[PDB]
Structures are given as C-alpha cells and as structure tokens.
Write a protein that binds this DNA or RNA. Structure first.
Ligand SMILES: [Mn+2]
Ligand SMILES: [Mn+2]
Ligand SMILES: [Mn+2]
Length: 430
DNA sequence: ATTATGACGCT
DNA sequence: AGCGTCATG
C-alpha cells in the first residue's frame, strides 16, 4: 500500500559507446567510416580474432570472437583494423586513451562510475532536480528528445522506424505530470533530456557516437541502453517493467547470463524475468542464497539499490598474454623473457598512471595457466610492489612462480605455460 | 587457438 | 589471501 518502496528514488543512466574500438579506428582512418569493418588482434592464426564489429558488418553476421578468415566468408568486403603490437603482445593504449576522453566529458555533467573501457553509469538525480527547478513547470518538448525511445510505446488504438519513435514519444509526453517535481516519470524524462545533451557533447567533442539507457537503477539503465542501438537512447519507466519482463529471458539481465541464471531457470522451471514475481523472498533466498534471493525478489519488480560508485578510474592495471598450443613457454629463458615483456608494458602504464592520477600501486598479482588445466587461471600469487621497475617486477614474479616448474631439469619448464598475467593493485594516494 | 582485460563475491 | 564467476572491447 502506501509504504511499499517502489525503487523510483534515483535517476540513473548508462552510456555505452557504439562498437567502440571500431569507432576509434574509423576516426583515425576516414577510409573505414560507414563501411563494414571490424577490429582484430593478431593475424597469423585464422586472420586474427575479432573483438569489435561495425553495425554495417553485423548485418552480414560478423560478431566478436569470430576469426577474421571466417568473418570474410560472411562478408568478403569486410575491412579490418589491427590492434597495435608492442613487445610481442597486443597493446590497447589507443582505446584506453580514447576512453579517458569520453569519461572526462561525461564527468562534467555528473559523477560517473566507469563500468568498462567503453561504458559508464551516471547518477542524474541531483542534475534532474536542478533542471526541473530551472524549468519551473514548463512542459518538455519533443524537440528536446530527438533520439529518445520510450520503451513500451506506442500502444493502444505509419510504417517507418522514426515515425514509431515519435509516436511513442508523443504518447509519453502527452501523459506527463509536468506540475509535480516529485513524479518519477517526469524525473526520468528530464534525465533523458540531460543524456541527450551528454551524448551530443560526446559526439561533438570526440566524433564518437553512443547509445544510452535512462531508468531508476543500474540494471534497468543497462538493459534500456541495449534496446535501441546504435546512436539512440531508451527510457525504461517503472511502469514499463511488467510488460518488458513478461517476455525477457532471464539471461538478459546483468549477472544472470551464466551459471546462476541457468540454475534459476532449471530449479524454478521458468524462462522469463517476470515469472520470478510468483516466488516469495524466502523462497528465492532458499535456492540462491540470502543476497541473490533478496536481489532477485526486488529485481523482478524493477527495483535494485546498487549505487553508482564515484570511480572514473580503473582499480587495477593489468597485462596478460596467452600462449596457446604449440607456443606454450617451455624454457626458463622463455618464461623470463615474456615476464619481462609484460613487466615493461606494466611499468609504462603504471608510470603514466602515477603522473596523471596521483596514486601508486602497492601489490603485484602474478597469474599463470599450465597446459592441461581447464581453468582460466591455474595459480594466482601476490608479492609487494615497491618500485615501478620492470626488471624488479619480472624477477619478483619469477620468484613467486618458479616453484611451479615440476621439471627436474632446471632449464626446462614443465608443464609448459599457456598464460602469463601481471596485475598491479591496491592503489594509494600519492 | 575465443584474447585481453577488469569488477566483484566467496571462504 | 587465493579462487571462482560474470562481463566483452
Ligand atoms: Mn559499446
Ligand atoms: Mn560496453
Ligand atoms: Mn559489445
């Protein structure tokens, strides 16, 4: 009744760059613009592995994780850009620097949570209160929302996509209570006005397009962002959740796409998010644990409390490389040379980080994989990180892993190593 | 041989 | 602390 919390207290946006690494390469090389194109790392094995795909190329069925040679079978005119190689490994610096460009623009509008290289959440609650007070009670014009979709609309009693978008928006704005500074639908609408502004600033000042979702929490914002890509934004209201979730596969919700979501489906015998509403909180907690159970109980009703953390910088800085199959490292000389390559990239990135961001990492995590181990990581050990020196870091990592060589021969390495990873963690202000 | 990361939960 | 899970540019 009057005391149930509906989870409509916040306005939260998720901004996600469209096919980000492709756009970075297309800005640099105008010959790639408005073409089917993709970004690859390496080249010798099956033409390299695709990690990003332009929307033109997605129309041919090109996806991430495809080998470029197979993608060329689907799309013979596919254009390819390769990630830079430094010290024998992929080097993602260009895309990290482009990410910082975008994140710095977003930070002008509100504090953001960097969620990945290409995406950030925005807590717009306060910016919305301010813009509302500025607007007094002036209605919101459709012209302020030129790329916005309202999920669920139009409905009730033209065959073009843009025409449908405008119809849905008109129904939404016609139903608005613009006289109530506390109406959640109004607050989301003003949030969407602000996100149109943020996205226009990003495009004007970087050349990069993005999509976005606007809702009352992070999971709904992320889901909304996905609904109308590319170069569009979507408002998911509290009221739109029952219909949206009634046919939503559970795996589409962030954190339910792996084993936990499979167990929800199998144990409860359901397929769609909305079906979760029929279980009690205690029932869900009995199957999935206290935390997951309470989260699922609120989430299937559109309610989630995870805050937008004030964090625009990555918490860890890491360097990793796989050595698959016949290229696994089988001598100490090899292991030490590759630890040095990784350590040198880490030193470069860490020194830049210290100059830009006034912090220093204090812990070094060393991770390896051995041949014949299914797990991603086979051993993960930490050591102190007291100096930004690649030779010291590689010697320290070798010291923490050298007891892994089950070879009686001290020159050989067995079983051979199929992955090396160096990660700097536990930052302190300096 | 589906690679390079990066956040977070569990014990 | 070390491991597992979820996410994917
Ligand atoms: Mn993206
Ligand atoms: Mn993303
Ligand atoms: Mn993606």
């Amino acid at each position: 009744g009057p005391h149930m919390a509906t989870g409509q207290d916040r306005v939260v946006a998720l901004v996600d760059m469209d096919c980000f690494f492709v756009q970075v390469e297309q800005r640099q090389n105008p010959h790639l613009r408005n073409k089917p194109c993709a970004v690859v790392q390496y080249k010798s094995w099956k033409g390299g592995g695709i990690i990003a795909v332009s929307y033109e190329a997605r129309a041919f069925g090109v996806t991430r994780s495809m080998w470029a040679d197979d993608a060329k079978k689907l799309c013979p005119d596919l254009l390819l850009a390769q990630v830079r190689e430094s010290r024998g490994k992929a080097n993602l610096t260009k895309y990290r620097e482009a990410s910082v460009e975008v994140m710095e623009i977003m930070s002008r509008f509100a504090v953001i949570e960097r969620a990945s290289i290409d995406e950030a959440y925005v807590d717009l609650t306060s910016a919305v209160q301010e813009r509302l007070q500025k607007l007094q009670g002036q209605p919101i014009s459709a012209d302020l929302l030129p790329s916005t979709y309202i999920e669920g609309l139009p409905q009730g009693p033209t065959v073009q996509k843009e025409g449908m978008r405008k119809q849905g928006l008109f129904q939404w704005l016609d139903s608005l209570q613009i006289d109530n500074l506390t109406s959640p639908d109004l607050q989301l609408t003003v949030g969407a006005v602000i996100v149109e502004e943020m996205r226009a600033a990003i495009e004007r000042e970087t050349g990069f397009q993005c999509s976005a979702g606007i809702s009352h929490n992070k999971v709904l914002a992320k889901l909304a962002c996905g609904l109308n890509k590319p170069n569009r934004q979507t408002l998911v209201s509290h009221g739109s959740v029952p219909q949206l979730f009634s046919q939503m596969p559970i795996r589409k919700i962030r954190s339910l796409g792996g084993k936990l979501g499979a167990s929800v489906i199998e144990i409860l015998g359901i397929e769609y998010m909305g079906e979760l509403t029929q279980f009690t909180e205690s029932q869900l907690q009995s199957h999935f644990g206290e935390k997951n159970g309470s989260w699922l109980y609120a989430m299937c009703r559109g309610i989630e409390h995870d805050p937008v953390k004030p964090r625009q910088l990555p918490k860890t800085i890491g360097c990793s490389k796989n050595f698959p199959g016949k290229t696994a490292l089988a001598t100490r000389e090899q292991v030490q040379w590759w630890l040095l390559q990784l350590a040198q990239e880490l030193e470069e990135r860490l020194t830049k980080d210290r100059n830009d961001n006034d912090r220093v990492a204090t812990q070094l995590v060393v991770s390896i994989r051995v041949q014949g181990d299914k797990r991603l990581s086979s051993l993960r050990r930490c050591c102190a990180l007291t100096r930004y020196d690649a030779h010291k870091m590689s010697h320290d990592a070798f010291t923490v892993i050298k007891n892994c060589n089950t070879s009686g021969i001290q020159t050989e390495w067995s079983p051979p190593l199929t992955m090396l990873f160096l990660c700097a963690t536990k930052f302190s202000a300096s």
